[PDB]
Amino acid sequence: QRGMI
Amino acid sequence: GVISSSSIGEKINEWYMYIRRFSIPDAEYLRREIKQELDQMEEDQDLHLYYSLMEFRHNLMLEYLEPLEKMRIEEQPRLSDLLLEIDKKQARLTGLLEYYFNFFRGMYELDQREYLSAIKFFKKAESKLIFVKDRIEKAEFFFKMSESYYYMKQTYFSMDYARQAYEIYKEHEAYNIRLLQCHSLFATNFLDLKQYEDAISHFQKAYSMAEAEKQPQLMGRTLYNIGLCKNSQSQYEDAIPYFKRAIAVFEESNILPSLPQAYFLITQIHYKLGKIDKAHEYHSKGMAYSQKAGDVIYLSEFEFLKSLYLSGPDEEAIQGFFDFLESKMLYADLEDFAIDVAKYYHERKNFQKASAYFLKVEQVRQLIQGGV
Numbered sequence: 606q607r608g609m610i
Numbered sequence: 611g612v613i614s615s616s617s618i619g620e621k622i623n624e625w626y627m628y629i630r631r632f633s634i635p636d637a638e639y640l641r642r643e644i645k646q647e648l649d650q651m652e653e654d655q656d657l658h659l660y661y662s663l664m665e666f667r668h669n670l671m672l673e674y675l676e677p678l679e680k681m682r683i684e685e686q687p688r689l690s691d692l693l694l695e696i697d698k699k700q701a702r703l704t705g706l707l708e709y710y711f712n713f714f715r716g717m718y719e720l721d722q723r724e725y726l727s728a729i730k731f732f733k734k735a736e737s738k739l740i741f742v743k744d745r746i747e748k749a750e751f752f753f754k755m756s757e758s759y760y761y762m763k764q765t766y767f768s769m770d771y772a773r774q775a776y777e778i779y780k781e782h783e784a785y786n787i788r789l790l791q792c793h794s795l796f797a798t799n800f801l802d803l804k805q806y807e808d809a810i811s812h813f814q815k816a817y818s819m820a821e822a823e824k825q826p827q828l829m830g831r832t833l834y835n836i837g838l839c840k841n842s843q844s845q846y847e848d849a850i851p852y853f854k855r856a857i858a859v860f861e862e863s864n865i866l867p868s869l870p871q872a873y874f875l876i877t878q879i880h881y882k883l884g885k886i887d888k889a890h891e892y893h894s895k896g897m898a899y900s901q902k903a904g905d906v907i908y909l910s911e912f913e914f915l916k917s918l919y920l921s922g923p924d925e926e927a928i929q930g931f932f933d934f935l936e937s938k939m940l941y942a943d944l945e946d947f948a949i950d951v952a953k954y955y956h957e958r959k960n961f962q963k964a965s966a967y968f969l970k971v972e973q974v975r976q977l978i979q980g981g982v
Contacts, residue, residue, distance in 0.1 A: 606875055607942055608798035608838055609831035609868065610757050610791055 613647050615657045621647070622660055629664070629671050630750060632787045632825075637668055656707070659699055663710045666692045670717055675827055678864035693718060709738040713751065720758055723907060725939050728758050729982065746785070749778035753788060756795050763942045763978060769799045790819040790828060794835060801839055809839055826863035830856045834872055846879045853879075870900040870908035877912070878950075881919045889919075910934065914947065918954060925963070932970075941978040945971060 621644050628636040641664075648661055669689050679686065696711060703711055716731035732755060742748060756771035772795040779785045779792060797812035817832035837852030853876040860868045873896025880889040893912060900909040910931060917927040928951060935944040952967030 606838060606871065606946060607761050608794060608801070608835045609871065610760065610794050610798070 613651065615651075615654050618644060618647055618651070618657055619660065622664055625664055626667070627746075629668055630746060630788075631784050632671060632675060633784075634672065634675060637671070641665065641668060655699075656702065659696070659703060660707060660710075662692060662696055663707065663714060666696060667710075667714050667717075670714070670721075673867070675825060676863075677827070677868075678866050680864060689718075705738075706741045706743075709735050709741050712738065713754070716758075717754060720754070720761075723761075723938070723940070725758065725761055729762075732758060733982075745778055746782060749775045749785075749788070752778070753791065753795075756792075760795055760798055761942065762939075762981060763802060763945075764981065765799050765802050767982075768795065772796055772799070786819055786823055787825070787828065790816050790823065790832075793819070794832065797835065797839070801842055806839070806843060810836075813839055826859055827865055827868065830859040830865060830868055830872070833859065834868075834875075838875065841875060841879065846883055849879060850876065866899070866903045867905070870896060870903055870905045870912075872896075873899055874908060874911060874915075878915060881915065907938075907940075911943070911947075918951065923951075923954070936974075941974055945974050945978065948974060 621640065625637060625640040625644060628640065644661065648658060651657070665688070669687065669692065673687070673689065693715070696715075700711055712731045712735035716728050716735060719725075719727035719731055732751075735751065736755075739748070739751065742751075752771045752775035756768050756775060759765075759768035759771060762768075772792050775788070776792040776796075779788045793812045793816035797809045797816060800806070800809035800812065813832065813836050817829075817836060820828040820832040833852055833856035837849040837856065840846075840849035840852060853872060857869070857872045857876070859865075860872055873892055877889055877892035877896055880886065880892060893915065897909065897912045900906075900912060914928065914931045917924040917931065921927075932944060932948065935941075935947070948967050948971045952964045952971065955961070955964035955967060
């Protein structure tokens with residue numbers, strides 16, 4: 606899961 | 611009568627500058643005024659094209675900040691078609707207009723997780739970058755490149771592009787949202803590199819700015835990120851309160867496109883550590899959210915949870931899901947998930963499967979290399 610930019 | 615293609619062009623550029631500043635009201639006002647003047651000339655296509663491009667951008671911002679579209683039964687979004695209108699007339703435009711077209715189209719493809727598309731568009735924009743006059747525009751571009759590379763785990767390039775954007779944003783008055791976001795990017799990359807000490811620091815500065823800005827999107831997102839960082843460290847229990855808090859903020863102000871991701875990590879956690887009842891409760895909420903937000907991808911990921919924990923383990927389903935992610939260039943999620951799966955098979959009796967999945971991870975890293 607990737608960060609919420 | 612003062613108004614002329616040149617008169618409105620300047621007004622449009624002014625309009626753009628407020629968009630970049632995330633200042634919704636000024637933008638709205640300028641847009642409305644500008645629309646009226648446009649209606650008046652009726653004369654020139656390109657000016658209208660410029661307007662359309664800006665409106666597209668304008669909407670990207672609204673969608674981000676107060677995205678939520680508690681759905682009037684049927685007026686939407688202008689995003690889908692506006693994309694259409696511009697797409698229809700893309701040959702008409704050169705110079706700065708060509709840059710904007712590609713840049714904004716890149717931005718859209720980026721939030722659809724069409725990372726391949728996004729990056730091509732961006733490269734194309736980059737070429738036309740010589741037509742860009744002010745330094746903040748370069749900054750926006752750097753910021754977007756950074757964001758895209760982050761999603762692709764191109765850590766060096768992501769981080770370095772964040773630096774470039776930061777330097778330009780910092781020297782400017784009212785770009786706290788983008789500064790906040792740069793910190794997020796710095797942190798999320800540090801997280802990739804395992805540099806937790808740095809990551810935390812940045813996550814936190816980011817969050818702190820989020821509060822000063824009072825923007826629900828960013829608050830939720832910053833919180834989610836802190837929790838993500840905890841989770842990354844395998845310290846699951848500590849991640850929960852940070853996720854829950856983020857959910858509350860996203861729900862509170864109806865930030866629907868953000869909700870699916872939120873639910874997902876929390877959900878995985880509970881199952882992980884055995885608290886199943888909460889798991890289904892979160893799962894259902896998140897599956898439901900991903901439909902409402904039309905996040906088919908997250909929907910599939912939630913199904914994947916189902917696929918693994920219950921009915922444990924639906925290998926054919928897992929394999930399918932991985933092929934999907936792979937064919938969609940979604941290598942980072944693929945890597946994480948492959949890991950979860952291998953570990954999960956390891957704590958359970960049998961290593962045939964776990965070894966195979968660990969082997970899949972290394973493959974994926976080598977492959978993950980190819981891009982740009």
